[PDB]
Amino acid sequence: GSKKKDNLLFGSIISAVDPVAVLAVFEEIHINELLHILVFGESLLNDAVTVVLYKKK
Numbered sequence: 001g002s003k004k005k006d007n008l009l010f011g012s013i014i015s016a017v018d019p020v021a022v023l024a025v026f027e028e029i030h031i032n033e034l035l036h037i038l039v040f041g042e043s044l045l046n047d048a049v050t051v052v053l054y055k056k057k
Contacts, residue, residue, distance in 0.1 A: 005011035
């Protein structure tokens with residue numbers, strides 16, 4: 001439940017950071033590729049923050 005966002009600050013700015021920067025993305029996604037826009041944003045950092053930290057000993 002609760003609100004629909006965590007804080008317009010990140011749901012209004014980072015979510016609208018220069019529409020051009022957000023639109024430049026619509027040039028590589030066909031809707032069905034707008035949802036994974038968040039899943040492909042982490043899998044990258046998650047594998048680049050843990051592997052770069054201690055690269056599994």
